[PDB]
């Protein structure tokens, strides 16, 4: 009791977060896009309605909180998040940071300037809303670009000043987490403040246990993603991969079996609208996973239970781990 | 009489446009940036105040209208434009199109989809404001990227449907205008609907007269840009170049002397805030050209008069040419 986390509806006690999905999106887009071209999504109204239906379905399955890791350059619309959170009665934690599509006005900035931006979104509020970010999202796609090095350093500095955790996008097959770790540690950031994400995109347990041993949280966060049976769709293949959800879920058990139950975070990386990829990708996704953000509780958790993972362990992964991660520390 | 152009304050008669600067910016930024980080500019209030002071200075020097060619990805804020236009009593024509920093949500789009976006901003309104674009801005930096080819085609299609003109950013030293012309003509766009911009960044009159002969408008639109005396500043050198404003202004006379007075558009490419380049670039610019958008009437026009260009010719360049260009045709 006592510790608090910021959500799009204001502060909540850490203990009320409950079953928490730590890497999710209401909408995957671009800065200013929803404001300029809402018809891309049918309408803003239709997008909101779809998101509310989706979050209510997750809620029914026992999800109490999601962390929307959409940054500025993912086109995060905090007003939209607040609206859908209110209508579905599911907590949403918003993010600061930068993903891999920053515009020039961000790309030209120094580490000091980026630190000031991230601190603004955490301490003051996002835009003119007063809604405060509760996590910092960063990204590499292979070896960090020079700018990405600055972003990771600024994220470490903002985290040290505020206690808010850092979470990452990686190219997992390229083992980006090792370089990300080195950068964070060079700034004196504690590994317990960091989740190395998309770590279920690889079956390389040497890579994953190496990180877990050092105290990093390992994000197994793309559970429903698979293009099995859609191999003729090049764009779906490239984004989803050729590994089954069962293959992804097996990594949760693998890390538990190797003593790392306290180092695992589980999610879908789902969304309800998606403009930063090919047209109609959302329709393809909705066909692969009609359950959306209820997929983890409905399919993954029972799968693990049937493999013999104890209820206490599953509760520790889906409740205790997100709570420790999100609590400002 | 009769013909109309759309401005940020609504429709105006073409004949009231008067002395018009055809390539300008209130603020050079990025989509969503002003909303997310207004403190970059001191504040939104300070930016607006500076812009109002600047436009009032231009107005005093005889400027009646500017065309703000900031696109979505230049971080065009049409509400800001409306506010400053009202306060300074200077007409501002807003733009649609895409410059060279489009985010993924734009880069993934087809020619048909881009055409729909440009038509939305021209026919329906920008964002939720009802303010209609009166020009389409496009850009290459050397040979067009595959996406840039789509953008130029969509611009041609939107222009053919609405009569609104198209204006371009080029790498002038790379003679981009020739490829841009070929793309536009392949879509059946009339050259009289097109301005090939930043054409004063080169002294190549073979290139420029080639375009003018075909009926293109030639944009001599960076008049005050020079890093002479600032050669120790690498970023200023790269952006401003090493040619004097007099050297740029001489090209106006050159084209007049070769029979092309009706094919010339003159401007500054100035701005009052600038986040898409190095920090404090605005301070450097304000030192080089304290007159801002009054520089053309105060310095360039008298320079040309003193070289013997008749008043009637100068009036044709600064009034008649913009009127014919902007009138939907
Ligand atoms: Co990602
Ligand atoms: Co994601
Ligand atoms: Co330009
Ligand atoms: Co410009």
Q: Which keywords apply here?
A:
alpha/beta, homodimer, Phosphotriesterase (chains A, B), TIM Barrel, TAT_signal (chains A, B), 13 helices, 329 residues, binds cobalt (II) ion
Describe the structure.
Chains A, B: Zn(2+) 1 binds at residues 23, 25, 137, 269. Chains A, B: Zn(2+) 2 binds at residues 137, 169, 198, 269. The structure is a homodimer of 329-residue chains. With 329 residues, the first copy, chain A, is of the alpha/beta class. Chain A has one domain (1-329): Alpha-Beta Barrel (TIM Barrel), CATH 3.20.20.140. Chain A is built from 13 helices and 13 strands. The first copy, chain A, has helices at residues 33-36, 44-60, 78-88, 104-107, 111-124, 146-162, 176-186, 205-213, 234-240, 245-257, 281-288, 295-306, 311-326; strands spanning 4-7, 10-13, 20-24, 27-28, 65-68, 91-93, 95-97, 135-139, 166-169, 194-196, 217-220, 264-266, 273-274. In chain A, the strands form 4 sheets. A 6-stranded parallel sheet of chain A has the order 7-8-9-10-11-12. The first copy, chain A, has a 3-stranded parallel sheet with strand order 3-5-6. A two-stranded antiparallel sheet of chain A has the order 1-2. In chain A, helix 2 (44-60) crosses helix 3 (78-88), helix 5 crosses helix 6 and helix 6 crosses helix 7 (176-186). Chains A and B meet through helix 1, helix 4 and helix 5 of A and helix 1, helix 4 and helix 5 of B. Bound molecules: cobalt (II) ion (4 copies). Residues 23, 25, 69, 269 of chain A line the site of one cobalt (II) ion (CO).
């Amino acid at each position: 009791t006592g510790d608090l986390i910021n959500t799009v509806r204001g502060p909540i006690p850490v203990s009320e977060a409950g079953f928490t999905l730590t890497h999710e999106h209401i909408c995957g887009s671009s800065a200013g896009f929803l404001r300029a071209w809402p018809e891309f999504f049918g309408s803003r109204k239709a997008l909101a309605e779809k998101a509310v239906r989706g979050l209510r379905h997750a809620r029914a399955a026992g999800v109490q909180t999601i962390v929307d890791v959409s940054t500025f350059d993912i086109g995060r619309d905090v007003r939209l998040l607040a609206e859908v959170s209110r209508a579905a009665d599911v907590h949403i934690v918003a993010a600061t940071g930068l993903w891999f599509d920053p515009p020039l006005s961000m790309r030209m900035r120094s580490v000091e300037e980026l630190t000031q931006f991230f601190l603004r979104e955490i301490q003051h509020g996002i835009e003119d809303t007063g809604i405060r970010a509760g996590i910092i999202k960063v990204a590499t796609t292979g070896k960090a670009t020079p700018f990405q090095e600055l972003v990771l350093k600024a994220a470490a500095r903002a985290s040290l000043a505020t206690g808010v955790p850092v979470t990452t996008h990686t190219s997992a097959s390229q083992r980006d987490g090792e370089q990300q770790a080195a950068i964070f540690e060079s700034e004196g950031l504690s590994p317990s403040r960091v989740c190395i994400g998309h770590s279920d995109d690889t079956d390389d347990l040497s890579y994953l246990t190496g990180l877990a041993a050092r105290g990093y949280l390992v994000g197994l966060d793309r559970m429903p993603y698979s293009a099995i049976g859609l191999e003729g769709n090049a764009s779906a293949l490239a984004l989803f991969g050729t590994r089954s959800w069962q293959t992804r879920a097996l990594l949760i058990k693998a890390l538990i079996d190797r003593g790392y139950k306290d180092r695992i975070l589980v999610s879908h990386d789902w969304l309800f609208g998606f403009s930063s990829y090919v047209t109609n990708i959302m329709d393809v996704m909705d066909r692969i996973n009609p359950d959306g953000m209820a997929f983890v509780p409905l399919r993954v958790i029972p799968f693990l239970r049937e493999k013999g993972v104890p209820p206490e362990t599953l509760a520790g992964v889906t409740v205790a781990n997100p709570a420790r991660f999100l609590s400002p520390t």
